[PDB]
Amino acid sequence: THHHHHHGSMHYKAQLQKLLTTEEKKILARLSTPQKIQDFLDTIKNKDLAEHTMWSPRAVLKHKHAHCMEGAMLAALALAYHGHSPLLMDLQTTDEDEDHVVALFKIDGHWGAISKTNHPVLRYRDPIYKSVRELAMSYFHEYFIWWTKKNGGKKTLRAYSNPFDLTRYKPERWVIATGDLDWLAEALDDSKHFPILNKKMQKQLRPASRIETKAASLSEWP
Amino acid sequence: SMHYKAQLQKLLTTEEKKILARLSTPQKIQDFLDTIKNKDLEHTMWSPRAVLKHKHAHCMEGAMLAALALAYHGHSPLLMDLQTTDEDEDHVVALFKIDGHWGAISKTNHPVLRYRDPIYKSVRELAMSYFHEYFIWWTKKNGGKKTLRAYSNPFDLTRYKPERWVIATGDLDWLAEALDDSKHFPILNKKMQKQLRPASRIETKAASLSEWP
Ligand SMILES: [Zn+2]
Ligand SMILES: [Zn+2]
């Protein structure tokens, strides 16, 4: 079976079709499973700033380059195109680290996540997680400072957002935007988050090992 | 707990007790296991005594020592089995709790299936934190296949006379077998298994890195 009953929106899909070129739609039509979407993001070059800005799905399809939220927004678009809600989840760190965004999806009542990253951490999640919490917690141990010895190995994840439904915005605002979508990032950051720790628990945390920081440092793209 | 500790003290040498006395937090225990050389197996199943003597351990050997150290400071000596398909080997950790939250001490040579901080609200939640990083990384044949299938209830070693495992000179294969036979909870059904996606090449490369050469 492949169908489009994932509680997205026929009306919403119609609005998307009005905005997209034939080429864009032909691509999105092929990306009919979460797995196919992740496979597609694997062929996109991970970004650098070798401007460096928060591109729309349109820009990403044109230039075949993406950082995490650019990847997740394209994924959410592709999920919506096949009848899922376009859902983002923010993973919120201390100010020592950058947040990471994934695109949530469900298959047979279980949560998965599509993720664009250059490192072997914060990757795709299979639809096997019984709750958003359970999925989010599967990231905690592998979210740490690996790029400097300053707080080397410190675990930096502090909270996860409720699923963030992009349906609330006019699709023009993000799908095909030419501006900076920093307002969208900001709206995500400002949405309901659930803390993972209290102060006591934070004091318990143990740094990741040297082998872990070395492993995390590996790069998919030069 | 106090009674159990007393029984352990009867069995242990002064040197062994001096070591266990130092390992007074789960974090200190993990730090200690980090100084023990990881194995690379003919196969063994050494007691905590043997492990302290030879300073060498595979995963269950590490977890049994951890459980001992936890018990010496009044925690239950709990193991959790992580059970894979036939394509992979199981992994064992020592569970612990601090302020109502589960953590895990783990002995491994690779940057996966590591220590877990006491932040997980249930055994299930902790176990699920291992799923994505349990995969075939050593061959191209089913490269990246995710192999974890079930986790055990906490396995309390209190059910056995401590003589039987703490200081045993025999093979503790019976203990491994008892663990493997205890209540397990499946993570997938057949439908979910069909959804699984292989880990990426970058992930298998990362998993292949070694702490001990
Ligand atoms: Zn479709
Ligand atoms: Zn954020």
- Supply the CATH classification number for the domain B2-208: 3.10.620
Return the domain boundaries, chain B: 2-208
Per residue in B20-58, is it b (16+ CB within 10 Å) or e — as a string?
Answer: beebeebbebbebbeebebbeeeebbbbbbbbbeeebbb
The CA-based diameter of chain A, rounded to the nearest angstrom, is 55
Q: Which ligand is nearest to the CA of A89?
A: 2
Residue A16 Cα to ligand 1 midpoint, Å, equals: 14
Q: Where are the alpha helices (DSSP H) in B84-196?
A: 123-128, 163-166, 173-181, 190-195
Nearest CA in chain A to B108: A211
Nearest to A116 by CA among A59, A155, A182, A60: A60
How far B204 CA sits from the closest chain A CA (Å)? 9
Does residue A138 contact residue A129 with C-beta atoms inside 8 Å? yes
Tell me whether residue B70 is exposed, middle or buried, using C-beta atoms within 10 angstroms of its C-beta: 0 to 12, 13 to 18, 19 or more. buried
List of long-range contacts for A184-192, beta carbons under 8 Å, 24+ apart: A184/A54, A184/A73, A185/A54, A185/A69, A185/A101, A188/A69, A188/A88, A188/A90, A188/A101, A188/A161, A188/A164, A189/A90, A189/A92, A189/A99, A191/A90, A191/A161, A191/A162, A191/A164, A192/A161, A192/A162
| Matching residue, tokens 């992930």 | B203
Q: Which residue of B has its CA nearest to A205?
A: B117
- CB-based burial of residue A97 (10 Å sphere; 0-12 exposed, 13-18 middle, 19+ buried)? buried
B126/B122 Cα distance (integer angstroms)? 6
B124 to chain A: which residues are within 8 Å by CB? 130, 134
Identity at A21, one-letter amino acid code: T
Ligand that comes closest to the CA of residue A80: 1
Residue of A7, A16, A10 lying closest to A169 (CA atoms):
A16
CATH architecture of A10-217: Roll (3.10)
Query: What's the CA dihedral at B105, B111, B117, B120 to 10 degrees?
Result: -100
Scanning chain A, the segments in alpha helix (DSSP H) are 10-19, 22-30, 34-42, 57-63, 68-81, 132-137, 172-175, 182-190, 199-204, 210-217
- Data resolution in angstroms: 2.6
Task: Using alpha carbons only, give the angle B98, B104, B108 rounded to the nearest 5 degrees.
Answer: 155
A202 touches chain B (CB under 8 A): no
Residues in chain B closer than 8 A to A205 (CB atoms): 117, 119
* SS3 call for A103: strand
Contacts of A61-64 spanning 24+ positions with Cβ under 8 A: A61/A24, A61/A27
Instruction: Give the minimum alpha-carbon distance from B109 to chain A in angstroms, rounded to a whole number.
Output: 9
Query: What is d(CA B169, CA B12) in angstroms, rounded to the nearest whole number?
Result: 14
Chain-centroid distance, C-alpha A166 = 13
**DSSP string covering A19-62, please?**
HS-HHHHHHHHH--SHHHHHHHHHTSEE----------HHHHHH
Closest ligand to residue A37's CA? 1
DSSP three-state, residue B13: coil
Contact B116 A141 (CB under 8 A): yes
Candidates B30, B206, B211; nearest CB to A218: B206
Helices (H), B84-188: 123-128, 163-166, 173-181
